[PDB]
DNA sequence: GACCACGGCGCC
DNA sequence: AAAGGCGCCGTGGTC
């Protein structure tokens, strides 16, 4: 490959290497460019960064957060991670794609643009003809690419101090946990260590073992078989509640701090893009898909993550996101109706679980709710669902001959989607995204019954992303035209930054975009609500 | 220091 | 522990 002077012309692929895998925290060691039989290499990676006008190629969205950064709008365009992505969802990091589809992932970046230029090559013409794919690589992911950069580079307001001062607080109510279970234990102990745990709760204490572990048949500590230990001794509770706090503490209160940028005084999460079997996004280093709120510690960690000084945060999320997809992609009449008409199912499942008025519902009662909808829809046993609920199997048999009964479409949906996953070795999304699932011809019950249940779980979930980044790709140039942010995507939510005095006309555009974003035979719900923190706008 | 598997658990 | 999708913790082990 001929080596030609640095300034590559426009459109060529684009090579780089990283110090760390975090763009916001990386050093641009090298950067290197491809096209028509030359290979360019920048002899300083960083002014080099300047003379491109978008990047092309593998990871391009990492350089585009870099670009951003440092002050510079490098959009990313074309990347073949995101069409061999779409082929195959398996297809999730460079050096797999890179052995699949025509080379090898160095630590070199001219060879990295070379690299891209003949994967995209090669990947663009596996997709001749897929015109499905390729609609939703033009309309949804390499746009999506770009609004993830502008998130990636933004980062979210976190209030620092208050978590330092929570830390101190929660370090001494551990404390008195600790020295609790040491004294029921006759003996300290390593807490944290599951394996110490076993032994004291399970041979020096006489608890009986309810389960195992998965792997290595190891007698099981965990929540569930805790909860039903709940008073067959007082160490049990203390644990439970020592296990919440630390979780907590070493996730999320100690790590988040330390992670602030000191350029943009903001915490910067990665989006991830090619990481899921179904389409949705992950989020790493550090997870804000998962920061807590259930509990109330919980909701005090989400308090920190606040709106900038004369800005308001708005948070929209989708009501019931994967049931109206249900009723769309089967076509249930009972299940259309209920939306139609308006009805809710989580708090129609609640307030019969826990035996009140649908008025006496809350927050916490919906969350309980959530488990048994959605667990039951999916393959759940019935020995499990009497064991959340905390009833007979008797009661919990019958619920799955109730939550069933009433609609023949999704009985008929689900095994026309195995019997179609099974003859053409994938599933797909409303939109066509495939996940290939293997092992539903198995011939062992428990791996294709496990292989069944992610199959059909996936048209559901993959098609509720497939619409959430749709929404996100048509709101972004609105918010941008208003000078407002998007700052974080949860699945089904997302959360924005509005100035005050733009907050109230953001959150009812927004709202307004993701309601109408692709309409289905029922209606799209979004709850929203505006607030100076993550908590309050929701509440 | 790094990487890994595992159990465990946060969120959707 | 009991018939979906993730990423990160501490442990325990390894190199
Ligand atoms: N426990 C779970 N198991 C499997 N899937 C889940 C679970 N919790 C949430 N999800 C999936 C299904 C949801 O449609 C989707 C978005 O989550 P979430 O907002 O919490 O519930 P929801 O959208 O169905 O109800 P709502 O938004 O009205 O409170 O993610
Ligand atoms: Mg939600
Ligand atoms: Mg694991």
């Given at each position: 490959?001929?080596?030609?002077?640095?300034?590559?012309?426009?459109?060529?692929?684009?090579?780089?290497?990283?110090?760390?895998?975090?763009?916001?925290?990386?050093?641009?060691?090298?950067?290197?460019?491809?096209?028509?039989?030359?290979?360019?290499?920048?002899?300083?990676?960083?002014?080099?960064?300047?003379?491109?006008?978008?990047?092309?190629?593998?990871?391009?969205?990492?350089?585009?957060?870099?670009?951003?950064?440092?002050?510079?709008?490098?959009?990313?365009?074309?990347?073949?991670?995101?069409?061999?992505?779409?082929?195959?969802?398996?297809?999730?990091?460079?050096?797999?794609?890179?052995?699949?589809?025509?080379?090898?992932?160095?630590?070199?970046?001219?060879?990295?643009?070379?690299?891209?230029?003949?994967?995209?090559?090669?990947?663009?013409?596996?997709?001749?003809?897929?015109?499905?794919?390729?609609?939703?690589?033009?309309?949804?992911?390499?746009?999506?690419?770009?609004?993830?950069?502008?998130?990636?580079?933004?980062?979210?307001?976190?209030?620092?101090?208050?978590?330092?001062?929570?830390?101190?607080?929660?370090?001494?109510?551990?404390?008195?946990?600790?020295?609790?279970?040491?004294?029921?234990?006759?003996?300290?102990?390593?807490?944290?260590?599951?394996?110490?745990?076993?032994?004291?709760?399970?041979?020096?204490?006489?608890?009986?073992?309810?389960?195992?572990?998965?792997?290595?048949?190891?007698?099981?500590?965990?929540?569930?078989?805790?909860?039903?230990?709940?008073?067959?001794?007082?160490?049990?509770?203390?644990?439970?509640?020592?296990?919440?706090?630390?979780?907590?503490?070493?996730?999320?209160?100690?790590?988040?701090?330390?992670?602030?940028?000191?350029?943009?005084?903001?915490?910067?999460?990665?989006?991830?893009?090619?990481?899921?079997?179904?389409?949705?996004?992950?989020?790493?280093?550090?997870?804000?898909?998962?920061?807590?709120?259930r509990?109330?510690?919980?909701?005090?960690?989400?308090?920190?993550?606040?709106?900038?000084?004369?800005?308001?945060?708005?948070?929209?999320?989708?009501?019931?996101?994967?049931?109206?997809?249900?009723?769309?992609?089967?076509?249930?009449?009972?299940?259309?109706?209920?939306?139609?008409?308006?009805?809710?199912?989580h708090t129609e499942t609640a307030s019969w679980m826990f035996g009140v008025?649908?008025?006496?519902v809350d927050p916490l009662m919906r969350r309980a709710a959530k488990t048994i909808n959605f667990g039951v829809?999916?393959?759940?046993?019935?020995?499990?669902l009497?064991?959340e609920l905390a009833?007979?199997?008797?009661?919990?048999?019958?619920?799955?001959?109730?939550?069933?009964?009433?609609?023949?479409?999704?009985?008929?949906?689900?095994?026309?989607?195995?019997?179609?996953?099974?003859?053409?070795?994938?599933?797909?999304?409303?939109?066509?995204?495939?996940?290939?699932?293997?092992?539903?011809?198995?011939?062992?019950?428990?791996?294709?019954?496990?292989?069944?249940?992610?199959?059909?779980?996936?048209?559901?979930?993959?098609?509720?992303?497939?619409?959430?980044?749709?929404?996100?790709?048509?709101?972004?140039?609105?918010?941008?035209?208003?000078?407002?942010?998007?700052?974080?995507?949860?699945?089904?939510?997302?959360?924005?930054?509005?100035?005050?005095?733009?907050?109230?006309?953001?959150?009812?555009?927004?709202?307004?975009?993701?309601?109408?974003?692709?309409?289905?035979?029922?209606?799209?719900?979004?709850?929203?609500?505006?607030?100076?923190?993550?908590?309050?706008?929701?509440?």
């Amino acid at each position: 490959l001929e080596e030609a002077p640095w300034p590559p012309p426009e459109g060529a692929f684009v090579g780089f290497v990283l110090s760390r895998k975090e763009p916001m925290w990386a050093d641009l060691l090298a950067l290197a460019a491809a096209r028509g039989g030359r290979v360019h290499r920048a002899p300083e990676p960083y002014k080099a960064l300047r003379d491109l006008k978008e990047a092309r190629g593998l990871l391009a969205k990492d350089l585009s957060v870099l670009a951003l950064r440092e002050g510079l709008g490098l959009p990313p365009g074309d990347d073949p991670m995101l069409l061999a992505y779409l082929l195959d969802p398996s297809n999730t990091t460079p050096e797999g794609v890179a052995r699949r589809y025509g080379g090898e992932w160095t630590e070199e970046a001219g060879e990295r643009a070379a690299l891209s230029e003949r994967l995209f090559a090669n990947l663009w013409g596996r997709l001749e003809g897929e015109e499905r794919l390729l609609w939703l690589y033009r309309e949804v992911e390499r746009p999506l690419s770009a609004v993830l950069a502008h998130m990636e580079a933004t980062g979210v307001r976190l209030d620092v101090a208050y978590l330092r001062a929570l830390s101190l607080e929660v370090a001494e109510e551990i404390a008195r946990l600790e020295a609790e279970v040491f004294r029921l234990a006759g003996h300290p102990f390593n807490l944290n260590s599951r394996d110490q745990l076993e032994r004291v709760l399970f041979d020096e204490l006489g608890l009986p073992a309810i389960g195992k572990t998965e792997k290595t048949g190891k007698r099981s500590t965990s929540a569930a078989v805790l909860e039903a230990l709940r008073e067959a001794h007082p160490i049990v509770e203390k644990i439970l509640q020592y296990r919440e706090l630390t979780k907590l503490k070493s996730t999320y209160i100690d790590p988040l701090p330390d992670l602030i940028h000191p350029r943009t005084g903001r915490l910067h999460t990665r989006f991830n893009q090619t990481a899921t079997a179904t389409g949705r996004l992950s989020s790493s280093d550090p997870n804000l898909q998962n920061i807590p709120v259930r509990t109330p510690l919980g909701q005090r960690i989400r308090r920190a993550f606040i709106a900038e000084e004369g800005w308001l945060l708005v948070a929209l999320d989708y009501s019931q996101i994967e049931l109206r997809v249900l009723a769309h992609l089967s076509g249930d009449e009972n299940l259309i109706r209920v939306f139609q008409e308006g009805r809710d199912i989580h708090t129609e499942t609640a307030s019969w679980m826990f035996g009140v008025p649908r008025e006496a519902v809350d927050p916490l009662m919906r969350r309980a709710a959530k488990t048994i909808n959605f667990g039951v829809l999916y393959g759940m046993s019935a020995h499990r669902l009497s064991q959340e609920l905390a009833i007979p199997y008797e009661e919990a048999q019958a619920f799955i001959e109730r939550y069933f009964q009433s609609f023949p479409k999704v009985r008929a949906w689900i095994e026309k989607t195995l019997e179609e996953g099974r003859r053409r070795g994938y599933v797909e999304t409303l939109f066509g995204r495939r996940r290939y699932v293997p092992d539903l011809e198995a011939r062992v019950k428990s791996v294709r019954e496990a292989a069944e249940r992610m199959a059909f779980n996936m048209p559901v979930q993959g098609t509720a992303a497939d619409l959430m980044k749709l929404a996100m790709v048509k709101l972004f140039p609105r918010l941008e035209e208003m000078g407002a942010r998007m700052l974080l995507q949860v699945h089904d939510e997302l959360v924005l930054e509005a100035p005050k005095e733009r907050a109230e006309a953001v959150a009812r555009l927004a709202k307004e975009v993701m309601e109408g974003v692709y309409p289905l035979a029922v209606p799209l719900e979004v709850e929203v609500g505006i607030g100076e923190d993550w908590l309050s706008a929701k509440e």
